mmCIF file of C-alpha atoms in Angstrom:
data_model
loop_
_atom_site.group_PDB
_atom_site.id
_atom_site.type_symbol
_atom_site.label_atom_id
_atom_site.label_comp_id
_atom_site.label_asym_id
_atom_site.label_seq_id
_atom_site.Cartn_x
_atom_site.Cartn_y
_atom_site.Cartn_z
ATOM 1 C CA UNK A 1 -2.920 91.692 -56.035
ATOM 2 C CA UNK A 2 -6.030 93.970 -56.526
ATOM 3 C CA UNK A 3 -6.563 94.556 -60.234
ATOM 4 C CA UNK A 4 -8.811 96.759 -62.127
ATOM 5 C CA UNK A 5 -12.091 95.471 -64.519
ATOM 6 C CA UNK A 6 -9.883 96.481 -67.523
ATOM 7 C CA UNK A 7 -6.623 94.379 -66.453
ATOM 8 C CA UNK A 8 -9.175 91.678 -65.500
ATOM 9 C CA UNK A 9 -10.461 91.734 -68.852
ATOM 10 C CA UNK A 10 -7.190 91.761 -70.551
ATOM 11 C CA UNK A 11 -6.327 88.553 -68.846
ATOM 12 C CA UNK A 12 -8.915 86.729 -69.845
ATOM 13 C CA UNK A 13 -8.390 87.856 -73.251
ATOM 14 C CA UNK A 14 -5.133 85.772 -73.212
ATOM 15 C CA UNK A 15 -7.353 82.587 -72.884
ATOM 16 C CA UNK A 16 -10.043 83.114 -75.138
ATOM 17 C CA UNK A 17 -10.333 83.527 -79.149
ATOM 18 C CA UNK A 18 -10.115 86.812 -80.624
ATOM 19 C CA UNK A 19 -13.280 89.181 -82.025
ATOM 20 C CA UNK A 20 -16.689 88.772 -81.757
ATOM 21 C CA UNK A 21 -18.952 85.707 -82.833
ATOM 22 C CA UNK A 22 -21.760 87.957 -83.907
ATOM 23 C CA UNK A 23 -19.590 87.714 -87.276
ATOM 24 C CA UNK A 24 -21.061 84.099 -87.798
ATOM 25 C CA UNK A 25 -23.938 83.750 -85.187
ATOM 26 C CA UNK A 26 -27.205 85.576 -85.621
ATOM 27 C CA UNK A 27 -31.157 85.393 -84.330
ATOM 28 C CA UNK A 28 -30.074 85.014 -80.634
ATOM 29 C CA UNK A 29 -32.626 83.881 -78.136
ATOM 30 C CA UNK A 30 -32.433 83.521 -74.444
ATOM 31 C CA UNK A 31 -33.673 80.183 -73.149
ATOM 32 C CA UNK A 32 -32.029 80.088 -69.821
ATOM 33 C CA UNK A 33 -30.522 82.036 -66.536
ATOM 34 C CA UNK A 34 -28.482 81.481 -63.918
ATOM 35 C CA UNK A 35 -26.770 83.283 -60.627
ATOM 36 C CA UNK A 36 -23.547 83.241 -63.300
ATOM 37 C CA UNK A 37 -25.536 84.781 -66.511
ATOM 38 C CA UNK A 38 -27.641 83.937 -69.282
ATOM 39 C CA UNK A 39 -27.714 80.969 -71.885
ATOM 40 C CA UNK A 40 -29.274 81.745 -75.397
ATOM 41 C CA UNK A 41 -29.524 79.584 -78.998
ATOM 42 C CA UNK A 42 -28.180 81.245 -81.828
ATOM 43 C CA UNK A 43 -28.075 80.111 -85.472
ATOM 44 C CA UNK A 44 -24.345 79.415 -87.052
ATOM 45 C CA UNK A 45 -24.150 81.456 -90.696
ATOM 46 C CA UNK A 46 -22.410 78.593 -92.822
ATOM 47 C CA UNK A 47 -24.576 75.394 -91.937
ATOM 48 C CA UNK A 48 -27.464 76.998 -90.159
ATOM 49 C CA UNK A 49 -27.255 74.871 -87.078
ATOM 50 C CA UNK A 50 -28.389 76.051 -83.480
ATOM 51 C CA UNK A 51 -25.301 76.399 -80.832
ATOM 52 C CA UNK A 52 -25.882 77.155 -77.280
ATOM 53 C CA UNK A 53 -23.796 80.431 -75.875
ATOM 54 C CA UNK A 54 -23.502 81.106 -72.449
ATOM 55 C CA UNK A 55 -22.799 84.934 -71.699
ATOM 56 C CA UNK A 56 -21.696 86.179 -68.151
ATOM 57 C CA UNK A 57 -21.183 89.630 -67.008
ATOM 58 C CA UNK A 58 -17.390 90.250 -65.769
ATOM 59 C CA UNK A 59 -18.990 92.906 -63.423
ATOM 60 C CA UNK A 60 -21.638 90.703 -61.981
ATOM 61 C CA UNK A 61 -19.857 87.274 -60.756
ATOM 62 C CA UNK A 62 -19.407 86.521 -56.938
ATOM 63 C CA UNK A 63 -15.844 85.417 -57.545
ATOM 64 C CA UNK A 64 -14.934 86.509 -61.400
ATOM 65 C CA UNK A 65 -11.507 84.495 -61.060
ATOM 66 C CA UNK A 66 -13.897 81.522 -61.715
ATOM 67 C CA UNK A 67 -14.318 82.848 -65.319
ATOM 68 C CA UNK A 68 -11.118 81.444 -66.379
ATOM 69 C CA UNK A 69 -11.832 77.951 -65.153
ATOM 70 C CA UNK A 70 -14.071 76.195 -67.737
ATOM 71 C CA UNK A 71 -12.595 78.076 -70.519
ATOM 72 C CA UNK A 72 -9.019 77.372 -69.626
ATOM 73 C CA UNK A 73 -9.277 73.653 -68.075
ATOM 74 C CA UNK A 74 -11.941 72.433 -70.803
ATOM 75 C CA UNK A 75 -10.027 74.075 -73.826
ATOM 76 C CA UNK A 76 -8.529 70.812 -74.926
ATOM 77 C CA UNK A 77 -10.264 67.798 -72.979
ATOM 78 C CA UNK A 78 -13.232 66.443 -75.522
ATOM 79 C CA UNK A 79 -15.509 63.023 -74.812
ATOM 80 C CA UNK A 80 -18.811 61.607 -76.506
ATOM 81 C CA UNK A 81 -20.843 62.059 -73.103
ATOM 82 C CA UNK A 82 -18.871 65.705 -72.252
ATOM 83 C CA UNK A 83 -21.022 68.656 -73.848
ATOM 84 C CA UNK A 84 -18.852 70.093 -76.799
ATOM 85 C CA UNK A 85 -17.297 73.629 -76.072
ATOM 86 C CA UNK A 86 -16.883 75.319 -79.201
ATOM 87 C CA UNK A 87 -14.768 78.278 -78.354
ATOM 88 C CA UNK A 88 -14.646 81.355 -75.926
ATOM 89 C CA UNK A 89 -14.628 84.947 -76.625
ATOM 90 C CA UNK A 90 -15.152 88.335 -74.793
ATOM 91 C CA UNK A 91 -18.024 90.696 -76.004
ATOM 92 C CA UNK A 92 -18.107 93.786 -74.113
ATOM 93 C CA UNK A 93 -17.876 93.077 -70.416
ATOM 94 C CA UNK A 94 -19.248 89.243 -71.067
ATOM 95 C CA UNK A 95 -17.421 86.354 -71.290
ATOM 96 C CA UNK A 96 -19.380 84.390 -74.261
ATOM 97 C CA UNK A 97 -18.842 80.373 -74.232
ATOM 98 C CA UNK A 98 -20.191 78.824 -77.677
ATOM 99 C CA UNK A 99 -21.447 74.945 -76.839
ATOM 100 C CA UNK A 100 -23.046 72.231 -78.182
ATOM 101 C CA UNK A 101 -27.188 72.436 -78.124
ATOM 102 C CA UNK A 102 -28.230 69.497 -76.824
ATOM 103 C CA UNK A 103 -32.162 69.314 -77.483
ATOM 104 C CA UNK A 104 -33.261 66.592 -75.491
ATOM 105 C CA UNK A 105 -33.551 68.888 -72.362
ATOM 106 C CA UNK A 106 -31.921 67.969 -68.647
ATOM 107 C CA UNK A 107 -32.087 64.892 -66.749
ATOM 108 C CA UNK A 108 -34.084 66.716 -63.885
ATOM 109 C CA UNK A 109 -37.133 67.331 -66.173
ATOM 110 C CA UNK A 110 -37.378 63.196 -66.029
ATOM 111 C CA UNK A 111 -36.293 62.512 -62.443
ATOM 112 C CA UNK A 112 -39.402 65.019 -61.560
ATOM 113 C CA UNK A 113 -41.799 63.883 -63.857
ATOM 114 C CA UNK A 114 -41.570 60.033 -64.446
ATOM 115 C CA UNK A 115 -40.006 56.615 -62.492
ATOM 116 C CA UNK A 116 -37.152 55.620 -64.199
ATOM 117 C CA UNK A 117 -36.263 51.805 -64.759
ATOM 118 C CA UNK A 118 -33.259 50.326 -63.546
ATOM 119 C CA UNK A 119 -31.863 49.769 -67.185
ATOM 120 C CA UNK A 120 -32.915 53.547 -67.483
ATOM 121 C CA UNK A 121 -30.526 54.575 -64.642
ATOM 122 C CA UNK A 122 -27.516 52.212 -65.614
ATOM 123 C CA UNK A 123 -27.597 53.494 -68.956
ATOM 124 C CA UNK A 124 -27.196 57.405 -67.554
ATOM 125 C CA UNK A 125 -24.664 56.157 -65.062
ATOM 126 C CA UNK A 126 -22.392 54.279 -67.997
ATOM 127 C CA UNK A 127 -22.067 57.481 -69.888
ATOM 128 C CA UNK A 128 -21.437 59.938 -66.714
ATOM 129 C CA UNK A 129 -18.914 57.167 -65.391
ATOM 130 C CA UNK A 130 -17.073 57.349 -69.009
ATOM 131 C CA UNK A 131 -16.946 61.251 -68.596
ATOM 132 C CA UNK A 132 -15.942 60.857 -65.200
ATOM 133 C CA UNK A 133 -13.120 58.370 -65.552
ATOM 134 C CA UNK A 134 -12.164 60.666 -68.730
ATOM 135 C CA UNK A 135 -11.883 63.705 -66.813
ATOM 136 C CA UNK A 136 -10.701 62.423 -63.590
ATOM 137 C CA UNK A 137 -7.529 60.570 -65.625
ATOM 138 C CA UNK A 138 -6.468 64.344 -66.789
ATOM 139 C CA UNK A 139 -6.679 65.860 -63.299
ATOM 140 C CA UNK A 140 -10.196 67.370 -63.973
ATOM 141 C CA UNK A 141 -12.814 67.905 -60.729
ATOM 142 C CA UNK A 142 -16.631 68.300 -62.080
ATOM 143 C CA UNK A 143 -17.295 69.498 -58.587
ATOM 144 C CA UNK A 144 -21.288 70.215 -59.187
ATOM 145 C CA UNK A 145 -22.481 66.749 -60.677
ATOM 146 C CA UNK A 146 -26.614 66.400 -60.335
ATOM 147 C CA UNK A 147 -29.420 65.915 -62.249
ATOM 148 C CA UNK A 148 -29.530 69.786 -63.801
ATOM 149 C CA UNK A 149 -26.247 69.502 -64.887
ATOM 150 C CA UNK A 150 -26.970 66.247 -67.175
ATOM 151 C CA UNK A 151 -28.389 66.920 -70.594
ATOM 152 C CA UNK A 152 -29.983 64.626 -72.942
ATOM 153 C CA UNK A 153 -29.620 64.558 -76.844
ATOM 154 C CA UNK A 154 -32.416 64.364 -78.899
ATOM 155 C CA UNK A 155 -31.840 60.405 -79.686
ATOM 156 C CA UNK A 156 -31.335 59.855 -76.011
ATOM 157 C CA UNK A 157 -27.368 60.184 -75.508
ATOM 158 C CA UNK A 158 -26.334 61.452 -71.954
ATOM 159 C CA UNK A 159 -23.499 64.432 -71.966
ATOM 160 C CA UNK A 160 -22.217 65.994 -68.596
ATOM 161 C CA UNK A 161 -22.423 69.654 -68.797
ATOM 162 C CA UNK A 162 -22.415 73.014 -66.539
ATOM 163 C CA UNK A 163 -18.489 72.981 -65.974
ATOM 164 C CA UNK A 164 -18.615 76.330 -64.589
ATOM 165 C CA UNK A 165 -17.332 75.219 -61.146
ATOM 166 C CA UNK A 166 -14.515 72.091 -62.577
ATOM 167 C CA UNK A 167 -10.947 72.387 -61.364
ATOM 168 C CA UNK A 168 -7.540 70.787 -62.169
ATOM 169 C CA UNK A 169 -5.643 68.947 -59.752
ATOM 170 C CA UNK A 170 -1.663 68.067 -60.566
ATOM 171 C CA UNK A 171 1.353 66.236 -59.057
ATOM 172 C CA UNK A 172 2.393 69.900 -57.336
ATOM 173 C CA UNK A 173 -1.368 70.577 -56.025
ATOM 174 C CA UNK A 174 -3.165 67.515 -55.886
ATOM 175 C CA UNK A 175 -5.918 68.547 -53.805
ATOM 176 C CA UNK A 176 -8.583 71.830 -53.959
ATOM 177 C CA UNK A 177 -9.902 73.380 -50.930
ATOM 178 C CA UNK A 178 -12.695 75.598 -52.403
ATOM 179 C CA UNK A 179 -16.378 75.361 -51.257
ATOM 180 C CA UNK A 180 -18.036 74.907 -54.933
ATOM 181 C CA UNK A 181 -20.985 72.636 -55.682
ATOM 182 C CA UNK A 182 -24.943 72.442 -54.697
ATOM 183 C CA UNK A 183 -25.723 72.200 -51.446
ATOM 184 C CA UNK A 184 -27.892 68.469 -51.499
ATOM 185 C CA UNK A 185 -25.004 67.055 -53.650
ATOM 186 C CA UNK A 186 -22.100 68.061 -51.915
ATOM 187 C CA UNK A 187 -19.590 65.427 -50.242
ATOM 188 C CA UNK A 188 -19.583 65.907 -46.344
ATOM 189 C CA UNK A 189 -15.257 66.625 -46.949
ATOM 190 C CA UNK A 190 -16.361 69.942 -49.241
ATOM 191 C CA UNK A 191 -18.764 71.187 -46.513
ATOM 192 C CA UNK A 192 -16.378 70.436 -43.922
ATOM 193 C CA UNK A 193 -13.802 72.710 -45.927
ATOM 194 C CA UNK A 194 -11.294 70.002 -45.825
ATOM 195 C CA UNK A 195 -8.785 69.590 -48.873
ATOM 196 C CA UNK A 196 -10.522 66.968 -51.686
ATOM 197 C CA UNK A 197 -9.832 65.421 -55.159
ATOM 198 C CA UNK A 198 -12.053 63.776 -57.709
ATOM 199 C CA UNK A 199 -13.937 61.697 -54.924
ATOM 200 C CA UNK A 200 -16.295 64.341 -54.734
ATOM 201 C CA UNK A 201 -17.654 63.714 -57.920
ATOM 202 C CA UNK A 202 -18.637 60.009 -57.306
ATOM 203 C CA UNK A 203 -19.989 61.251 -53.607
ATOM 204 C CA UNK A 204 -22.346 63.884 -55.925
ATOM 205 C CA UNK A 205 -23.014 60.983 -58.405
ATOM 206 C CA UNK A 206 -24.600 58.823 -55.349
ATOM 207 C CA UNK A 207 -26.699 61.611 -54.911
ATOM 208 C CA UNK A 208 -28.094 62.062 -58.624
ATOM 209 C CA UNK A 209 -28.837 57.776 -58.484
ATOM 210 C CA UNK A 210 -30.852 58.663 -55.153
ATOM 211 C CA UNK A 211 -32.487 61.779 -57.551
ATOM 212 C CA UNK A 212 -32.851 58.679 -60.555
ATOM 213 C CA UNK A 213 -34.617 56.311 -57.842
ATOM 214 C CA UNK A 214 -36.662 58.691 -55.322
ATOM 215 C CA UNK A 215 -36.841 61.734 -57.802
ATOM 216 C CA UNK A 216 -35.106 64.107 -55.288
ATOM 217 C CA UNK A 217 -31.795 63.929 -53.513
ATOM 218 C CA UNK A 218 -31.672 63.309 -49.894
ATOM 219 C CA UNK A 219 -33.402 65.944 -47.440
ATOM 220 C CA UNK A 220 -34.480 68.050 -50.395
ATOM 221 C CA UNK A 221 -37.810 69.065 -48.450
ATOM 222 C CA UNK A 222 -35.282 70.637 -45.202
ATOM 223 C CA UNK A 223 -33.240 74.328 -45.926
ATOM 224 C CA UNK A 224 -30.027 73.972 -47.351
ATOM 225 C CA UNK A 225 -28.397 74.297 -44.001
ATOM 226 C CA UNK A 226 -30.167 71.795 -41.897
ATOM 227 C CA UNK A 227 -29.485 69.284 -45.236
ATOM 228 C CA UNK A 228 -26.093 70.194 -45.105
ATOM 229 C CA UNK A 229 -25.416 69.747 -41.374
ATOM 230 C CA UNK A 230 -27.027 66.004 -41.884
ATOM 231 C CA UNK A 231 -24.669 65.064 -44.967
ATOM 232 C CA UNK A 232 -21.956 66.476 -42.811
ATOM 233 C CA UNK A 233 -22.685 64.884 -39.381
ATOM 234 C CA UNK A 234 -25.048 61.792 -40.593
ATOM 235 C CA UNK A 235 -24.298 57.903 -41.830
ATOM 236 C CA UNK A 236 -25.064 58.034 -45.796
ATOM 237 C CA UNK A 237 -28.237 58.583 -46.842
ATOM 238 C CA UNK A 238 -30.503 55.726 -47.836
ATOM 239 C CA UNK A 239 -33.139 55.449 -51.118
ATOM 240 C CA UNK A 240 -36.828 55.743 -49.564
ATOM 241 C CA UNK A 241 -37.872 51.983 -50.472
ATOM 242 C CA UNK A 242 -34.637 49.379 -49.916
ATOM 243 C CA UNK A 243 -37.166 46.842 -51.033
ATOM 244 C CA UNK A 244 -37.785 48.482 -54.443
ATOM 245 C CA UNK A 245 -34.365 48.778 -55.298
ATOM 246 C CA UNK A 246 -32.543 45.611 -56.438
ATOM 247 C CA UNK A 247 -29.005 43.840 -54.596
ATOM 248 C CA UNK A 248 -26.825 45.156 -57.275
ATOM 249 C CA UNK A 249 -27.980 48.748 -57.605
ATOM 250 C CA UNK A 250 -27.724 48.899 -53.518
ATOM 251 C CA UNK A 251 -24.126 47.634 -53.798
ATOM 252 C CA UNK A 252 -23.610 50.335 -56.705
ATOM 253 C CA UNK A 253 -24.805 53.114 -54.643
ATOM 254 C CA UNK A 254 -22.745 51.483 -51.455
ATOM 255 C CA UNK A 255 -19.868 52.019 -53.389
ATOM 256 C CA UNK A 256 -20.286 55.820 -53.977
ATOM 257 C CA UNK A 257 -21.978 57.090 -50.590
ATOM 258 C CA UNK A 258 -18.875 56.416 -48.676
ATOM 259 C CA UNK A 259 -17.816 59.033 -45.712
ATOM 260 C CA UNK A 260 -14.217 58.498 -46.329
ATOM 261 C CA UNK A 261 -13.141 59.630 -49.314
ATOM 262 C CA UNK A 262 -10.129 57.114 -49.649
ATOM 263 C CA UNK A 263 -12.838 54.224 -49.572
ATOM 264 C CA UNK A 264 -15.102 55.560 -52.066
ATOM 265 C CA UNK A 265 -14.978 53.856 -55.213
ATOM 266 C CA UNK A 266 -13.240 55.463 -58.355
ATOM 267 C CA UNK A 267 -15.170 56.297 -61.509
ATOM 268 C CA UNK A 268 -12.641 53.461 -63.128
ATOM 269 C CA UNK A 269 -13.757 51.029 -60.875
ATOM 270 C CA UNK A 270 -17.573 51.642 -61.103
ATOM 271 C CA UNK A 271 -17.385 51.352 -65.057
ATOM 272 C CA UNK A 272 -16.406 47.654 -63.972
ATOM 273 C CA UNK A 273 -19.508 46.843 -61.507
ATOM 274 C CA UNK A 274 -22.049 44.545 -62.999
ATOM 275 C CA UNK A 275 -24.965 47.264 -62.469
ATOM 276 C CA UNK A 276 -23.427 48.462 -65.513
ATOM 277 C CA UNK A 277 -24.705 45.281 -67.258
ATOM 278 C CA UNK A 278 -28.047 46.499 -67.054
ATOM 279 C CA UNK A 279 -27.456 49.786 -69.579
ATOM 280 C CA UNK A 280 -29.098 49.925 -72.703
ATOM 281 C CA UNK A 281 -28.931 51.512 -75.991
ATOM 282 C CA UNK A 282 -30.233 55.503 -76.595
ATOM 283 C CA UNK A 283 -33.702 54.262 -77.646
ATOM 284 C CA UNK A 284 -34.025 53.266 -73.498
ATOM 285 C CA UNK A 285 -33.572 56.971 -73.079
ATOM 286 C CA UNK A 286 -35.951 58.261 -75.496
ATOM 287 C CA UNK A 287 -39.428 57.333 -73.845
ATOM 288 C CA UNK A 288 -38.358 59.140 -70.609
ATOM 289 C CA UNK A 289 -38.573 62.370 -72.460
ATOM 290 C CA UNK A 290 -40.757 65.321 -72.345
ATOM 291 C CA UNK A 291 -41.870 64.925 -76.116
ATOM 292 C CA UNK A 292 -43.184 61.132 -75.759
ATOM 293 C CA UNK A 293 -44.301 60.590 -71.772
ATOM 294 C CA UNK B 1 -27.668 79.558 -28.608
ATOM 295 C CA UNK B 2 -24.548 81.019 -26.908
ATOM 296 C CA UNK B 3 -23.331 81.931 -30.591
ATOM 297 C CA UNK B 4 -26.421 83.664 -31.237
ATOM 298 C CA UNK B 5 -26.268 85.766 -27.719
ATOM 299 C CA UNK B 6 -22.856 87.234 -29.575
ATOM 300 C CA UNK B 7 -24.649 88.319 -32.706
ATOM 301 C CA UNK B 8 -27.824 89.681 -30.688
ATOM 302 C CA UNK B 9 -25.573 91.678 -28.844
ATOM 303 C CA UNK B 10 -23.754 93.365 -31.602
ATOM 304 C CA UNK B 11 -27.017 93.917 -33.382
ATOM 305 C CA UNK B 12 -27.794 96.223 -30.104
ATOM 306 C CA UNK B 13 -24.116 97.866 -30.148
ATOM 307 C CA UNK B 14 -24.547 98.367 -33.988
ATOM 308 C CA UNK B 15 -28.592 100.122 -33.364
ATOM 309 C CA UNK B 16 -27.325 102.098 -30.550
ATOM 310 C CA UNK B 17 -24.048 103.401 -32.772
ATOM 311 C CA UNK B 18 -26.812 104.008 -35.869
ATOM 312 C CA UNK B 19 -29.529 105.730 -33.791
ATOM 313 C CA UNK B 20 -27.551 106.916 -30.888
ATOM 314 C CA UNK B 21 -29.330 104.800 -28.641
ATOM 315 C CA UNK B 22 -28.634 103.078 -25.558
ATOM 316 C CA UNK B 23 -30.813 99.887 -25.485
ATOM 317 C CA UNK B 24 -29.004 97.476 -23.069
ATOM 318 C CA UNK B 25 -29.268 93.503 -24.240
ATOM 319 C CA UNK B 26 -31.032 90.910 -21.618
ATOM 320 C CA UNK B 27 -31.711 87.704 -24.045
ATOM 321 C CA UNK B 28 -32.550 86.029 -27.613
ATOM 322 C CA UNK B 29 -36.024 85.159 -27.533
ATOM 323 C CA UNK B 30 -35.912 83.176 -30.595
ATOM 324 C CA UNK B 31 -33.344 82.625 -34.125
ATOM 325 C CA UNK B 32 -33.608 81.655 -37.516
ATOM 326 C CA UNK B 33 -30.932 80.321 -39.317
ATOM 327 C CA UNK B 34 -30.847 80.778 -43.210
ATOM 328 C CA UNK B 35 -27.769 80.045 -45.600
ATOM 329 C CA UNK B 36 -27.772 82.905 -48.565
ATOM 330 C CA UNK B 37 -24.292 81.683 -50.216
ATOM 331 C CA UNK B 38 -22.362 78.788 -50.513
ATOM 332 C CA UNK B 39 -19.572 79.649 -53.229
ATOM 333 C CA UNK B 40 -16.285 80.277 -51.790
ATOM 334 C CA UNK B 41 -17.748 81.059 -48.317
ATOM 335 C CA UNK B 42 -20.854 80.322 -46.211
ATOM 336 C CA UNK B 43 -23.117 83.476 -46.083
ATOM 337 C CA UNK B 44 -25.771 83.315 -43.263
ATOM 338 C CA UNK B 45 -28.937 85.307 -42.522
ATOM 339 C CA UNK B 46 -30.011 85.500 -38.966
ATOM 340 C CA UNK B 47 -33.670 86.598 -37.878
ATOM 341 C CA UNK B 48 -33.511 87.308 -34.263
ATOM 342 C CA UNK B 49 -36.200 87.996 -31.509
ATOM 343 C CA UNK B 50 -34.196 89.628 -28.483
ATOM 344 C CA UNK B 51 -35.246 91.448 -25.267
ATOM 345 C CA UNK B 52 -33.614 94.880 -24.681
ATOM 346 C CA UNK B 53 -33.995 97.630 -21.932
ATOM 347 C CA UNK B 54 -35.051 100.916 -23.457
ATOM 348 C CA UNK B 55 -34.856 103.644 -20.566
ATOM 349 C CA UNK B 56 -34.749 100.742 -18.084
ATOM 350 C CA UNK B 57 -37.872 98.918 -19.254
ATOM 351 C CA UNK B 58 -37.457 95.497 -21.376
ATOM 352 C CA UNK B 59 -38.772 95.441 -24.844
ATOM 353 C CA UNK B 60 -38.795 93.319 -27.702
ATOM 354 C CA UNK B 61 -37.115 93.563 -30.922
ATOM 355 C CA UNK B 62 -36.173 92.013 -34.693
ATOM 356 C CA UNK B 63 -32.736 92.289 -35.861
ATOM 357 C CA UNK B 64 -31.403 90.741 -39.486
ATOM 358 C CA UNK B 65 -27.763 89.879 -39.318
ATOM 359 C CA UNK B 66 -25.698 89.014 -42.299
ATOM 360 C CA UNK B 67 -22.728 87.108 -41.472
ATOM 361 C CA UNK B 68 -19.651 85.464 -44.155
ATOM 362 C CA UNK B 69 -17.514 82.476 -42.862
ATOM 363 C CA UNK B 70 -15.350 79.914 -43.757
ATOM 364 C CA UNK B 71 -16.909 77.225 -42.282
ATOM 365 C CA UNK B 72 -20.691 76.117 -41.723
ATOM 366 C CA UNK B 73 -22.349 78.510 -39.382
ATOM 367 C CA UNK B 74 -22.212 79.151 -36.226
ATOM 368 C CA UNK B 75 -18.688 79.073 -36.384
ATOM 369 C CA UNK B 76 -16.495 82.369 -35.995
ATOM 370 C CA UNK B 77 -17.858 84.809 -39.088
ATOM 371 C CA UNK B 78 -14.934 86.925 -40.576
ATOM 372 C CA UNK B 79 -17.526 89.495 -41.488
ATOM 373 C CA UNK B 80 -20.946 90.662 -39.515
ATOM 374 C CA UNK B 81 -23.312 93.375 -40.563
ATOM 375 C CA UNK B 82 -26.979 94.470 -39.068
ATOM 376 C CA UNK B 83 -29.343 94.833 -41.991
ATOM 377 C CA UNK B 84 -32.458 95.623 -40.186
ATOM 378 C CA UNK B 85 -33.412 96.416 -36.489
ATOM 379 C CA UNK B 86 -36.805 97.372 -35.624
ATOM 380 C CA UNK B 87 -39.045 97.253 -32.321
ATOM 381 C CA UNK B 88 -41.827 93.999 -32.659
#
């Protein structure tokens, strides 16, 4: 049904916290910007700690209906490897989401500027699979797994972020149909507009493992259309140099990059894979980070 | 490039309605496909070089066509819009 901007604002008000967090947040500084809106750091008045605030204009969205997803779905879900969402507010024509500020930057900076060893890759995969196993069990699909969506803490812990595209499946609605994600990381069934479940996150995770091995996802040198035709039509993508990757990591990757969704490994199955025996403590991540390179 | 020729014909028709012109389509010469949207639906920009007859004489034109589709281009688009049409 056609609804006014003001009707939409009233509907979104029902699922956010009342009032304006400028009562307890000051010294806002813009640090990032997307198609969605901007990301600010602010100082909390009681503790003096830094928090992140995502600001999204209700009038400047491709699909404004998508503003409900993260604030509704992730409200009551919490995990040590998922970025903490504290609260959401409507401030004028903007949705504000107040979240943990992780000060270790994104995994993208690491994979673009260093060669991760298999211990470090195993460390990232263990943390992300713990997050995905928890989320998938609740029927949550992230739908935008990639290095940019993975944030590091100052002490080298790994958290899944950027839940803007997330969805929830149930017994009555077991599949999603929406075209969402990032071209190079999209599962073939997403590109083909087939009904899908949590399996799409395991494909995307496979592509992120190729980022950690090769520095870029497959076909990243090609335009998105050309890349997505290859993902849709071609055999699963391979690493640049099979002889530089262990048999256990190739086996791990082989369970994720499976075209038939029902034959793809689950997060729970991958948690038991011997590759994750190479996982190390947060201190094995710290040396990769921009500050210490 | 059959799907392309239909987009090129649409571009010529839209130009003729816009400028009260009477250009007669001949053929697509070259075509660039560019994805510009991949959330909710596919949005593709086509950059077409096409031959059309003006007053009976075959001339070359560059057309920019914006299409939305549920499936990867060049599947049946639910929206088409001429953005640019000029002689080369």
